[PDB]
Structure formats: C-alpha cells, structure tokens
C-alpha cells in the first residue's frame, strides 16, 4: 500500500528510486542510475494501485523516467511496469520499456526492453492535445515546460470505463536533426467506478508534422499470487494520431 | 559456442530445456514447464550465433515451443531471445514472448512478457508462403503437418542482407471459434556475409481469411559483456501480410 511503496528502492544494477505514494494512486520521485547515459537525479513520476484486491496478490504500479536533467539530456525515457510485494523481504517485480528519440528510418531499433527488481536493501506545444489510438481509446494530456505529462485516459477496450488519471514525463529538449521526442506516461485502472487491480505503462516518441503520431509499445502489469507473477505481465503496441 | 549450449538448463521457475546446438546454428530439444497450461515434454527450435566475437560478449540465441503436444494444447507459444555467457557459473538470460490464439477482439491481450535465467544446475496451408512486413521483410516459411516452421528472412534494414535460416514452431491444432493460431520463430543474424552477433524471435498468431495476417511482437538480443547486458534487448512489433 501507500505506506509500503512510499521509501526508496534499490535495483540489481545498484540504481537508487525514491518515492512517495500519495492516498490518490500518484507515485512521484527521484531515479539515480548506477548504469547509462545518466548522472544525479531524475524526476520521476507514475501511478498505483490504491485498492489493491485483498487475496495476497501484489499492488500493480508504473512510473516514467526522462533521462533529462540540468547536466544531460539522452533522448530518451524509461517506463517500469509492475507489482510491490509487500513483507518481511518487500519487492518491486518490473518489466522497463526505454524508447529513445530516432529518425523514422532508426524507429524501429527504438525501443529497449528488461526487468528490473527492487528491494528495501542493497515538444510541449506537438504534445499537449487529444490523441486517439487504433482501438479507439483516448489520451488528453498537457505537456509541461518541464517535462512533465498529466492528463487522462479513456480506453474503449478491457475492464475500464470513463477517465482515468495519467501521469508521464517528455524530454523537454529533444535533438533537433528530426529525430521523435522520446517520452511515456503510466494509467493507474483504478478510478471512482472499476479497479482493475492493473497498470500500463507506454513508452514511445512523438513525431510532428502533418500527421504527428506517438508510436509506443505498452506494458500491461495485474496484480498476481507469487504463483501467477511469471503470468502478469500483457505487452503491445498503440500508434497515437491527433484524428481518430 | 556449441560445446558450452549444448545440454540441460533449468530456470527460476524450475522448468528444463533440454538442447543440442549444431554447427550450423541450429537449435533443437525439449522444454517441460513447472507451470502454466503444460504437461510433459514440448519440442523446442532455434537458432544461435555459431560464430560470436572474441571480447568476452554473450552469445545471441532463441527458440519457440508451441505448447501443443499429444496431452495438451495450450493454443500458445512462447519465444525466448537471450544470450548464453559460458564459464564457472554459465548462463542463458532470455527475455520470453508469450502469444495466445485470440479472436481479433482480444488481440491487444493476447501476448505475457517475462524474463528468464537458465543454469546448468537446478493452418499449414494457411501459413505455407511468402509474408512481407511494413518495413519491406521477407519471410519465407514452411509449415510441417508436426507444428515445425522452417524457412529463410530477408530483412530490408538492420546489420543483414541476403537470407537467414529461421525457424519455429505453431500450433497444428488451433481451436475453431475464430481464434488465430500462435506462433514463433528465430532468426540467428549470421550468414555466409555478415555476422550481427544478435538473434531475432517473433511470437504471434496467424489470422486466415481475404486479407490473412501474421501479427507479431519480436525481440532482438545482441551478443554483450556482463556491464552491457541491461541494454541487450531491442522489442518491436512486425505485421506481415501475403501481399
């Protein structure tokens, strides 16, 4: 829960991830990376759970990370999809997507993909707008001069209905030799009328033009029993167009 | 290398793959699950970078069970794309696509996503043919009446040109509700020309019909030291069609 997330968290690379659970769902932080084109800290922010189901399954929650900060810009962000496991030996279980600005012809190669555990011990102006996928779902966000993305979610597919709260980040300077603007952002499924016991995550880059598109890949985590945690896990792809 | 893959691995979960590598990059055996919808042994393909670098970087590899055998059907199949890194404590660290049979309603939720570590100690004719992908590919396969997949991809980008073998599996007895048939398949990026130290795997499903489909997500693992392992792993998404 809120009081068992909130605290910082050490990965098997020796990455340091502090943050606070707020009662809402809202995670919020700092990531320090002992591996990459990283140095100091980054903002982080994302999404959890707050009524995890009470049959022992883990607390399903996702965050965002822009490897941008005032000594280095990487073009990229990571998103961490996932489960807290709470007791005398707590975990976070997650899968990452890190997607880095390309040109279309690299686009393909964009995209990343690990696990990470975690334990107790050891540009704005393209962006901001409404965007619509190939199922029909809906993304409003506004971009902030900062980095930061917030807005909601509406999906026309799985057990949802009406909005619920995004929060993600972007990189604020993105290369300007046409590469896309890396960024993700991470939903939370629960809301005031279904809790899917689930968090997405989308990790992806914005490209502008005529027809601007955010291609991302997504990672779907549910809260499972240790025995289902191999099976918790749903990945996929959405292209965002600014008409349906 | 040959020598150092070859034999009996288990993973966290405690399954065990059972695996000869060929000279020529082939990869074949058995996988037998500790969970999920699995009994018994499945017959495993793959393929592996026969000729690695020399800087102490793994050795890409993968291979596709569909979990059909003569007890089960699972209408699923399952990729696994990793590098083995030999030595005292020899590993396989793979990353896993899980693709079930789904109606076109349920294919955003067709496809787990998992990791495994591996140690040494504890619709055929439908298929059959030529797919193109939206970045030019070619993939040329054949379909066994057994569920085997074998063939050659041509890939319009990336470190690759002319054909690679591949090879796979699918599911020979899908279920008849409309679901696609799951899939897998591997492609080692050596040939007699170039050598990418990295391996492809795509899982997906085959969906028949005026404008068939083979809808895939793919991972490519490259050949890395221990500090690079972290960033090994590229994912995507491929959709082939006949035309």
Do not use: M
């Amino acid at each position: 829960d809120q009081a068992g997330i909130t605290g910082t968290w050490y990965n098997q690379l020796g990455s340091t991830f502090i943050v606070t659970a707020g009662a809402d769902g809202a995670l919020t932080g700092t990531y320090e990376s002992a591996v990459g084109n990283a140095e100091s800290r980054y903002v982080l922010t994302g999404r959890y759970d707050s009524a995890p189901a009470t049959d022992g399954s883990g607390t399903a929650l996702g965050w965002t990370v822009a490897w941008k900060n005032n000594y280095r810009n990487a073009h990229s962000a990571t998103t961490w999809s996932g489960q807290y496991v709470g007791g005398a030996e707590a975990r976070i279980n997650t899968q990452w997507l890190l997607t880095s600005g390309t040109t279309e012809a690299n686009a393909w190669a964009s995209t990343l993909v690990g696990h990470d555990t975690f334990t107790k011990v050891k540009d704005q102006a393209g962006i901001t707008g409404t965007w619509y996928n190939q199922l029909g779902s809906t993304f409003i966000v506004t971009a902030g001069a900062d980095g930061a993305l917030t807005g909601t979610y509406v999906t026309a597919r799985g057990n949802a209905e009406s909005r619920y709260v995004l929060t993600g980040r972007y990189d604020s300077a993105p290369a300007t030799d046409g590469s896309g603007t890396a960024l993700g952002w991470t939903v939370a499924w629960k809301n005031n009328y279904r809790n899917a016991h689930s968090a997405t995550t989308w990790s992806g880059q914005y490209v502008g033009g005529a027809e601007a598109r955010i291609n991302t890949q997504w990672l779907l985590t549910s809260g499972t029993t240790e025995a289902n945690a191999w099976k918790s896990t749903l990945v996929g792809c959405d292209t965002f167009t600014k008409v349906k």
